[PDB]
Nucleic acid binder design. Structure first.
Ligand SMILES: [Cl-]
Ligand SMILES: [Cl-]
Ligand SMILES: [Mg+2]
Ligand SMILES: [Mg+2]
Ligand SMILES: [Mg+2]
Ligand SMILES: [Mg+2]
Ligand SMILES: [Mg+2]
Ligand code: NA
Length: 322
DNA sequence: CCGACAGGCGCATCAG
DNA sequence: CTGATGCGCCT
DNA sequence: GTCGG
């Protein structure tokens, strides 16, 4: 891509700040810069040109000048060569290991995938599964497989109760050619913000998906959110499909539009949109849009209504990507 | 200069 | 046990 | 790390 070198540099720095420094706002500032630069429709020629973009300040522009002059960043060169930094970064690639646990593990001498395997009894359940499927979870999912997974989940939900509506969101809904995982938003009429008229609405779907061997493991599971692993069936003599991450979110039926907006992302889009909601005197979460101490939920009966409240032209899901 | 930076589910842990 | 805190995760 | 007021 245009400015790929620059945006890669910034993403690496963001990951360093998140994973090693544990500085979430630096992480986010680097990602905001990477994002704005990725959308910039010109080959950046200097740091001063980039500095004109919102989210790119003096320090980034200075890094960009270094990167354009030399093709590298001494700061990242040092980070790359630093054994502890690299180890901590690596370990965070395991689902369930974040910055804190990564640092703790690296302090205890646990530096490698090899080390994690021989110390399974130091891992919680989520981390165990993340280690088990480490190579699989870094593989992306072609949209063709996403379509097959969608067919399974939609038909199996329908067998449980014809009144459930399952909507595949995330990058899939944004029209992406490949997805990192599957995100399923679920509603049922018995569950609204005013009442839960049936218990175990999510459990029943998760259980049905387990019975047919689609869901293979569970990372976490409560009344409204499921985080797990699933796999497509393969045919006689074929290599197995990789195991895949699947998230299911049961959202009150009358709060579907706020739910789908949230679940469609992108993550950066959601942060930008919620940050602009705040500037306009609103707060948005996956349930509601409220005036600001937040007040009572405003009426919504489309995704567009939410954009309208904050005075944004509608963006189609396909235009909410990075 | 500097306060704010999106919002929240599930789970592990801690105090009492 | 409850209630509070923070981690790691999701978009 | 960045930026609006
Ligand atoms: Cl974030
Ligand atoms: Cl709410
Ligand atoms: Mg991780
Ligand atoms: Mg993601
Ligand atoms: Mg996804
Ligand atoms: Mg997901
Ligand atoms: Mg947090
Ligand atoms: Na700028």
């Amino acid at each position: 891509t245009l400015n790929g070198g620059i945006t890669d540099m910034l993403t690496e720095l963001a990951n360093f700040e998140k994973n090693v420094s544990q500085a979430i706002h630096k992480y986010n500032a680097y990602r905001k810069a990477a994002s704005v630069i990725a959308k910039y429709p010109h080959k950046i020629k200097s740091g001063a040109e980039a500095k004109k973009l919102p989210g790119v300040g003096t320090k980034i522009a200075e890094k960009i000048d270094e990167f354009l002059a030399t093709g590298k960043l001494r700061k990242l060169e040092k980070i790359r060569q630093d054994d502890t930094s690299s180890s901590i970064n690596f370990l965070t690639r395991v689902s369930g290991i974040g910055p804190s646990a990564a640092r703790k593990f690296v302090d205890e001498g646990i530096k490698t995938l090899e080390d994690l395997r021989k110390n399974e009894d130091k891992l919680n359940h989520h981390q165990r599964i993340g280690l088990k499927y480490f190579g699989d979870f870094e593989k992306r999912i072609p949209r063709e497989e996403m379509l097959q997974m969608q067919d399974i989940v939609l038909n199996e939900v329908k067998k449980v109760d014809s009144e459930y509506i399952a909507t595949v969101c995330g990058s899939f809904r944004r029209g992406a050619e490949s997805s990192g995982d599957m995100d399923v938003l679920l509603t049922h009429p018995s569950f609204t913000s005013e009442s839960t008229k049936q218990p175990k609405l999510l459990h029943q779907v998760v259980e049905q998906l387990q019975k047919v061997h689609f869901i293979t493991d569970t990372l976490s599971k409560g009344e409204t959110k499921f985080m797990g692993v699933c796999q497509l069936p393969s045919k006689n003599d074929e290599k197995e499909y990789p195991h895949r991450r699947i998230d299911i979110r049961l959202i009150p039926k009358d709060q579907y539009y706020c739910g789908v907006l949230y679940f469609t992302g992108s993550d950066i889009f959601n942060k930008n949109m919620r940050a602009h909601a705040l500037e306009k005197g609103f707060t948005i979460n996956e349930y509601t849009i409220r005036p600001l101490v937040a007040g009572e939920p405003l009426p919504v009966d489309s995704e567009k209504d939410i954009f309208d409240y904050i005075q944004w032209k509608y963006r189609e899901p396909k235009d909410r990507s990075e």
